[PDB]
Amino acid sequence: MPLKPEEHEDILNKLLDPELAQSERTEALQQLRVNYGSCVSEYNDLTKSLARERDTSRRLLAEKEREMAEMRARMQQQLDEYQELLDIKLALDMEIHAYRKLLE
Amino acid sequence: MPLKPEEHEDILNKLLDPELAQSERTEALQQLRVNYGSCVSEYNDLTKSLARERDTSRRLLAEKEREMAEMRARMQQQLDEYQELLDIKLALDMEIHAYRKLLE
Ligand SMILES: [Cl-]
Ligand SMILES: [Cl-]
Ligand code: NI
Ligand code: NI
Ligand code: NI
Ligand code: NI
């Protein structure tokens, strides 16, 4: 996490202050440089992590899409099962009628 | 997108250079301040957008989970449908036998 702009200013003031000792001036300069570098690292990290979460979210959805596709196939299978039984149950309805007429 | 650390250095050098005119020194100081502020804005933007993509990815998955749950319910329904037909088809098998014995 980078310094808030208020804080980065306090460091610039010190750095740009000819009243403070050149040892403090130099320490400030370092903090400036490190805090900047830090912010740039966070930039690179978060840009990579955003892209990463994107590819990951999309990948995980595609897992659920193929899971759903698996379910649809099972669903069409239960239709084939249901149809097979139905064609026979109907055939038996026809039959039981014929035997009821013939024998009554 | 923030300046690469190499570039941020070129600006610090100018800023900290007593040989260059105080007008350039001041312009550099501004660029420093703006580029820093810029990086901090990108920080805030990307932290918010990462959290946002997170809540969004999780929300979209929960949409597919409830879509799948809808499918499971339809699947259990096709079992109730299938069972109902099966109990009757079996009852007819018993019946057609009885009529085949009684009348042959
Ligand atoms: Cl068909
Ligand atoms: Cl049962
Ligand atoms: Ni620091
Ligand atoms: Ni800085
Ligand atoms: Ni600039
Ligand atoms: Ni800076």
Author numbering:
A (entry chain A), B (entry chain A): 278 to 381
Relevant lines from the article:
Lamins represent a distinct class within the intermediate filament (IF) protein family. Lamin A (LA) and its splice variant lamin C as well as two closely related lamins B1 and B2 jointly form the lamina, a meshwork of ~3.5-nm-thick filaments located at the inner side of the nuclear envelope. Like for the whole IF family, the basic constitutive unit of the lamin filament is a rod-like dimer which results from a parallel coiled-coil (CC) structure. In line with this, the primary structure of lamins reveals a central α-helical domain responsible for the CC formation which is flanked by non-helical N- and C-terminal domains called the head and the tail respectively.
In addition, a construct comprising residues 1–49 of the Gp7 protein (N-terminal cap) fused by LA residues 327–403 was prepared. The last chimera additionally included a F40C point mutation, located at heptad repeat position ‘d’ within the Gp7 cap. To this end, experimental phasing on sulphur atoms could be used, which had been facilitated by an engineered disulphide bridge in the dimeric Gp7F40C cap. The tail domain part (residues 382–403) is disordered in the crystals. While the LA 305-387 structure becomes increasingly disordered towards its N-terminus, our fusion with the Gp7F40C cap provides for a proper stabilization of the LA sequence. First, the capping motifs used (and especially the Gp7F40C cap that had been additionally stabilized by a disulphide bridge) provide for the correct assembly of dimeric, registered CCs even for short lamin fragments.
